[PDB]
Amino acid sequence: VSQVRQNYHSDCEAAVNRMLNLELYASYTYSSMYAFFDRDDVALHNVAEFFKEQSHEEREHAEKFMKYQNKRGGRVVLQDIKKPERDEWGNTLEAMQAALQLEKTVNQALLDLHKLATDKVDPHLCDFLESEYLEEQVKDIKRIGDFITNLKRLGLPENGMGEYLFDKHSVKES
């Protein structure tokens, strides 16, 4: 038993490792989207940079779980990071829809981890999730949903001018 360990259930330790893998998986999926929008036959630079930043943020989420695991006296166990579901992402609308579903999948895993932490009476883990993870998900899900609404308004997928304008006006100029 780690000398620091107190009120930290083995199930929660394991679930934190699984969550860590999912954060890394999400990072890798976003990195794939970045590379896609940087292709010369796609060429939406601000969209590409948006997904690059999304990828970097997921890696930070992963690293925070590693640090958490050690703070509680659990042990980080890594597994393969599975490649993303697609090799090409269609267009800005398809990619944003996939991002929305990814962020909701991550959110559900975090909510499930909160359920487990609650069941095991671990208020520190509950607070960690609430203070560091759950609001980030709600905020980003809202942001991405708002983007999707605007992409549809702009006539995606068919309206190329709409897609061009989204890249200029909706995402950060990079």
What residue ranges bind Cl ion (CB under 5 A)? 1-2, 5, 7-10, 14, 17, 77, 86-88, 101-102, 105, 111, 135-136, 146-147, 150, 170
Asked whether residue 63 is marked as a ligand-binding residue, the answer is no
Q: Is 155 left (phi over 0), alpha (psi -120 to 50) or beta?
A: left
Cβ neighbours around 7 below 10 Å, total:
12
Give the HSE-up count for residue 152: Cα atoms under 13 Å, Cβ half-sphere. Answer: 8
- Site mask for Mg ion (CB under 5 A), range 51-90, x = bound: --xx---x--x-----------------------------
Q: Cα separation of 49 and 34, whole Å?
A: 6
- Using the rule CB under 8 A, is 174 a contact of its own copies? no
Q: Which residues contact 148 (CB under 8 A, 6 or more apart)?
A: 93, 96, 97, 100
User: In angstroms, rounded to a whole number, what is the distance separating the alpha carbons of residues 17 and 75?
Assistant: 8
Residue 115 site contact among Mg ion, its own copies, Cl ion, none (CB < 5 to 8 Å, cut-off depends on kind): its own copies
DSSP assignment of 108-151: HHHHHHHHHHHHTT-HHHHHHHIIIIIHHHHHHHHHHHHHHHHH
Please, what is the minimum distance in Å from the beta carbon of residue 20 to its own copies? 9
Interface pick for its own copies out of 30, 31, 61, 102 (rule CB under 8 A):
31
Residue 11 or 109: the one with the smaller Cβ distance to its own copies is 109
Q: How far is the CB of 98 from its own copies (least distance, A)?
A: 13
140 binds Mg ion (CB under 5 A): yes
| Residue 90 touches which member of its own copies, Mg ion, Cl ion, none, C-beta under 5-8 Å by kind | none
Q: Report the binding-site residues for Fe cation.
A: 23, 58, 61, 103, 137, 140
